[PDB]
Amino acid sequence: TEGRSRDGGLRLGEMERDCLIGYGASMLLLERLMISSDAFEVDVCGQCGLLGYSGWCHYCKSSCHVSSLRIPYACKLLFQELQSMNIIPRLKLSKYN
Amino acid sequence: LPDVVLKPPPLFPDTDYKPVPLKTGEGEEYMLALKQELRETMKRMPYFIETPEERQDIERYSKRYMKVYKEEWIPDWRRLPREMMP
Amino acid sequence: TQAEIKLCSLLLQEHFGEIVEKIGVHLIRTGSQPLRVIAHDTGTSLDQVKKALCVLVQHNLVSYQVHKRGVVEYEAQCSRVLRMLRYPRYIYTTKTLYSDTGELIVEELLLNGKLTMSAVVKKVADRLTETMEDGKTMDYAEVSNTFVRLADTHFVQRCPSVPTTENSDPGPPPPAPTLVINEKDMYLVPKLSLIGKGKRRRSSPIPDDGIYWQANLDRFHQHFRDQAIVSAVANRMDQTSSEIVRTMLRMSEITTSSSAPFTQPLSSNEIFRSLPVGYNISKQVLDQYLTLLADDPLEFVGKSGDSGGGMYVINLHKALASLATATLESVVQERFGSRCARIFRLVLQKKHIEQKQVEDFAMIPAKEAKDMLYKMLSENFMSLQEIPKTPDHAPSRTFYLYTVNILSAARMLLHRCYKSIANLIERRQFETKENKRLLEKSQRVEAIIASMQATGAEEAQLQEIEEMITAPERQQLETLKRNVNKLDASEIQVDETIFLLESYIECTMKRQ
Amino acid sequence: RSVTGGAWYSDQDFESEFVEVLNQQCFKFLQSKAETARESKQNPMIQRNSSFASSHEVWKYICELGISKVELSMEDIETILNTLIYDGKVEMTIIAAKEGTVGSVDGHMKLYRAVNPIIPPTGLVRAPCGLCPVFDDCHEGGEISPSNCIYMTEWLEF
Amino acid sequence: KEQFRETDVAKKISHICFGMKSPEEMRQQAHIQVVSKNLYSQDNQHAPLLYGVLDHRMGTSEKDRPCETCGKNLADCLGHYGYIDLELPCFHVGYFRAVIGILQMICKTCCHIMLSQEEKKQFLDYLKRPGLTYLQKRGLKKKISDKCRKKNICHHCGAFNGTVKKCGLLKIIHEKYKTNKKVVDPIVSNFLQSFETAIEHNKEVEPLLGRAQENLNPLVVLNLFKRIPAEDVPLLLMNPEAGKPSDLILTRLLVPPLCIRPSVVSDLKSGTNEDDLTMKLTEIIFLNDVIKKHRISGAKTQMIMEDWDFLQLQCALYINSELSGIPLNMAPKKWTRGFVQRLKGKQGRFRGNLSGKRVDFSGRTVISPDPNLRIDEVAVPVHVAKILTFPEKVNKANINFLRKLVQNGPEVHPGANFIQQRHTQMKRFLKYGNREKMAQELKYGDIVERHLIDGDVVLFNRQPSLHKLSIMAHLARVKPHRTFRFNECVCTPYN
Amino acid sequence: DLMTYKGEVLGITRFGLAKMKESVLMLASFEKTADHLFDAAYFGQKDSVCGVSECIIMGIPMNIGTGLFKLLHKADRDPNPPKRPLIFD
């Protein structure tokens, strides 16, 4: 949350993000903005590139190409809002190697 | 004001108009028979290229007996450009 | 043209295969593209790409053109891929107008794409030697006679011939021969004196080399248009007018092309002397028929001159427009009923009309005419002019006038017919795929008998065929057979409406 | 008559059955007249003139029939015939005649004749796909698919 | 016996391919159909209706009522979409300019692109080059649009194609029958004379006969887009795999899950707090029902088109709640939050929830001078140290230190607060249970939320940041006071 | 140099930044969010994860800083170990 009365946390604003980028602490910036703030694990289908649930893709009615992925909850909300706006982001996953 | 609907409309709503029956006649029957004969005879035609099977399990003596044999038409390379020769 | 692409994909997958239908759909979607990029986009082997291109250009489906740097680009013919479905109708009309010899000639031409006259006559003879029996052999004389008759009647046409390389730029061979078309020898058959007898499939140098023939689909389209106009006038006035217009069209075919607003006018004297003697009709009766057809509010024929007695002309574009309007009103009647058809014809006769005027002229109570109008608007059978009083285009200060746009209506109906045939083909394929197991079972239990029919054929193998569990499945087999038959009949009959709409849309354009 | 009353309106209620009966009777009369003209086969022009039916003639015929009690006018019968034309079953022609038994329009006379349709029902209407109301939502893979269609299923079962 | 299937793969996103969905794909993605305009039931429990808005089958927004599609709570529910069919199509305000461009590019009769064969081949050859960038795509689109607008007649069918522009709001006008100062054309003459019956039955049509250009309503626009050849789709600079021209005109609306539409059950009154998207969707459903009722009852075209335009405007607001061409009488009374408004702005998803977002394990306190500490050291109060914890993994080095911290517990400053076992992820609170036993049963690999002790690296920052030196990582030292102290020599950076 | 590396002096505003950069996510996050998003949806332009802004948005280590290179483990191993000989083949 925002306020202290409602038990709110501090905000790493755009200026803080810029300072971290200038420093180059990539892992620090990641742990701050992704791990410790809005960390979440979603399920994405490798066939259609849509978001699934419980390792199941309702679009293709299959669960072989569905895989877990770490993603910020804010980014997931943005993807959902775009899909509602009809701007469908098709995520093409691949191995980390 | 319009009333509220509890369940969604049917996936296939009924219609009071039905399609007009097909025209009957020896001509239509012969056309149907000819189209069926074409469907049956064009798949075996050399022009009907099938998916080349691959990943054979093993080689056997019955390979020569079960070998599919079919004549292959020779395209006209004079009319066809040179980029299509094997 | 997603419906057209889907229909072409289904037709190619059902007629030639998958590795070829993929290339065909890729071509239809992307236009002209080099072979290397076509293969890179498809993702298959270069040999398979070459085979697909060759088997597609053999049937005159795709063409190759030269561009800068000597590159070759392959472009597919969606129009030809669509006309491919009209083969059964072509065979039927050629069998009706000619004999089984011409029927088999047209069949072989349509099934092989491009072949030589000698080859096609040999194939027809070999196939007719099986039709006939009792040692009677088939000679090539009558087959060549039928072939030259079809040629001079313009049902078969020679393909573009490759120019002589020795005379045209003798030297390095170009990547493509650049086949050209010549109208001089377009319908001139070669003089082949060699003859022979067809074989009965016992299973126990070319003079006309380079001269390939094909089926002239333009002639079949013109003949279908003529038959449609004849049937229309027959249902309208009488069979006498139908015979008269058939004779006029037969006389005009040779002197006119396949695209012209008006045909060459004919005179009463020539029409009379050309009309068959089978009808006891006189010159005054013919003149009366012509002058009463000229006064027809549908404008099938026209005077367009008074010299040489009774000079009259035929209005092909007007006839096609009338046929398209008839098709549209008939489909509206069958889809929404006689009242909606009445409203549609009213709003079509009246170029612009409002709801109150439609009601006053149709005598249809309120709450129904407006509903039918809104249904037609949602289904895209008409458009609103929406003449505004102010440039603000506010609904409360503008008049909405309904108007039926025949061109857009025909295009939408043609797209609907394409998608309907696509859905029917998909349903047939789905039924065949889901019942393939029973189909294979039937094929096996029938091959059990088809084998050893004569050699070592014992009677103890006839009472065990029906003993299997296939007997109760014969009902399902017959149901599938009749369903497939009805689906094929529907697909064939929708082809007539598709042809009508395509001819209308082709004749209503200028191509400037 | 425009603001109130009318031969069709009865107590602020449109007589759909009445107009349908009028249309059916007029079409039957015109069809019988055209059949008699075709059977006469004396001459094409005479056959056409006999198949032609005048507005006053059909009005007197409807009056002699007397289906309803309300008086039907020549303009009412003309509107009924225009509705029949819009229905695609009859054809009207305006000929030049100075004066006669009609004397309605100055110098012009409308003659009606029942005519057969241009072409029979087309092929699109013979398939369930052409008469489907949810045809817009058709798709290969989905809820509405031709493989599991009910329209085509019933059409093949019938 | 057992099939081999991979449990988890280290999948990394490569790139995002944006696109569009057709109505069929929208139906396939959606799970249920929302047709009821109401939200809750008539009973006093006020439960959400079935097949309606706020249904739990499209996610969950309450901690007590779980999702119906997936048997999970709100914290684990990702949400599901729904599809709502519209009686009449409507222009997509986001893609309205794209629709105008496509209409100006393609013909209004044959749906073909206004380009000759040579120009088509040139554009295909220029586009087939690898490494095509967004700027090059936009430049090619501009050039093709200019070259298509230069022409006036079609080379495929021969029909005339006038200018296409925007009139009013969400209405497209095509000047097909334009006024010709020179000899008029037979087409325009026939179009003008075809109003005989119109003028006879309404004299007001003759004075307004002019300016009667074609009105490309959503129906006609979709009918034209559905018949565009696929060969010309690449020429429109639109990826064919991403979407189709028929997708710009929407016939189904995608109602998002309840995670995006949070609902607060205010038991203090007879009402609840709902977002603006829910109200907009309810109004859209109500307008669809009203249009269906008018179609069934046979209403007048004028009011039918009025309702259609009102539905178009409501959809355009639901998409982007800030437009300019809104009529005065059709202007909304209050202000609503659209998707565009939620995305853009200072408190938006890009600037308010992605670039800058709030985190935990952080505090804010007043500073005080203390020269007795090094420049690289910062003082942290015991109160904030007992709250800010660090997860330390139990290893063969600090095993005894972690044991001592656990024995101390959350009360004494040097200690921990929670322990997460290696086998099970169930946290254990040290304030309850035998801390001695918890320390004696510390296995390697467990996590201990130890208190902030000396030697730990800690970030120290001032909210107004000008340069990178406004935030620095120091070493934390615990002190009994309640302020952040640091060497005053480092005040110049923080200012 | 960053302003004049394309041959034309491009400003740092929304009009001069879109011509230089290509990340759809970055262009949408900076300014003209909905406009740029709809334009990208229409063009079907696929956006990579090479930029720092989209890296931060997706929650992956940015390529700049410590993430430009990769680390390897100096484990005791033997590349291309001896293969067991096939007796039957």
Ligand code: SF4
């Ligand atoms: S449900 Fe079947 S019959 Fe109806 S439109 Fe779809 S494919 Fe055609």
Ligand SMILES: [Zn+2]
């Ligand atoms: Zn999927």
Ligand SMILES: [Zn+2]
């Ligand atoms: Zn859920």
Ligand SMILES: [Zn+2]
């Ligand atoms: Zn055009």
